[PDB]
């Protein structure tokens, strides 16, 4: 799962070079917060307060996206945690979320 998160980081790195025009456009609502890791080029139309919509250094909802991906990866049942590796799946998900928070601690910045 950490290798899958590293593959997601590699996908973010591959997306981090093929974006000449990164700004608001048709189809950028979810990509306005989804453009944190996929940081586009610095928008010329931004003012001196350009660090809110085109310079958003808020990779805390990326933890929410990792939580959504962990909840949608495998359906955690209500009785599959009787052993020490069923809630340990949630512990590994928390470790992956900590690694994602450390990785996206300076994503847009």
Partner 1 sequence: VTDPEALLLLPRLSIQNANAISSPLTWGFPSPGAFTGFVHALQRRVGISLDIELDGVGIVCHRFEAQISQPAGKRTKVFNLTRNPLNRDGSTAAIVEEGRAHLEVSLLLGVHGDGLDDHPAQEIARQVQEQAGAMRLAGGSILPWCNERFPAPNAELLMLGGSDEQRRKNQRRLTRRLLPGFALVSREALLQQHLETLRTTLPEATTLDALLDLCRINFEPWQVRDKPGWLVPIPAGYNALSPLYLPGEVRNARDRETPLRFVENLFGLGEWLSPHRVAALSDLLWYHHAEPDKGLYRWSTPRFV
Partner RNA sequence: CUAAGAAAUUCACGGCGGGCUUGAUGUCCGCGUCUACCUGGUUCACUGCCGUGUAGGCAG
Chain contacts with partner 1 (rule: CB under 8 A): 2-3, 6-7, 9-10, 12-14, 16-17, 103, 106
> Per CB under 7 A, does 17 bind RNA?
no
> Per CB under 7 A, does 52 bind RNA?
yes
Neighbours of 57 (CB within 10 A): 15
> Per CB under 7 A, does 42 bind RNA?
no
Alpha-carbon distances of 80 from 1, 50, 77, 100, 102, rounded to whole Å: 19, 48, 5, 26, 29
Chain residues binding RNA by CB under 7 A are 47-49, 52
């Amino acid at each position: 799962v950490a290798q899958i998160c590293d593959e997601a980081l590699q996908y973010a790195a591959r997306l981090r070079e093929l974006e000449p025009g990164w700004s608001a456009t048709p189809g950028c609502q979810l990509h306005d917060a989804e453009q944190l890791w996929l940081d586009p080029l610095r928008a010329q139309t931004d003012e001196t307060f350009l660090q809110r919509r085109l310079r958003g250094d808020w990779p805390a909802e990326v933890g929410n996206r990792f939580a959504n991906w962990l909840n949608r990866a495998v359906s955690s049942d209500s009785q599959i945690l009787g052993s020490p590796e069923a809630a340990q799946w949630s512990q590994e998900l928390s470790k992956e979320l900590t690694m994602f928070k450390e990785i996206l601690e300076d994503e847009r910045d």
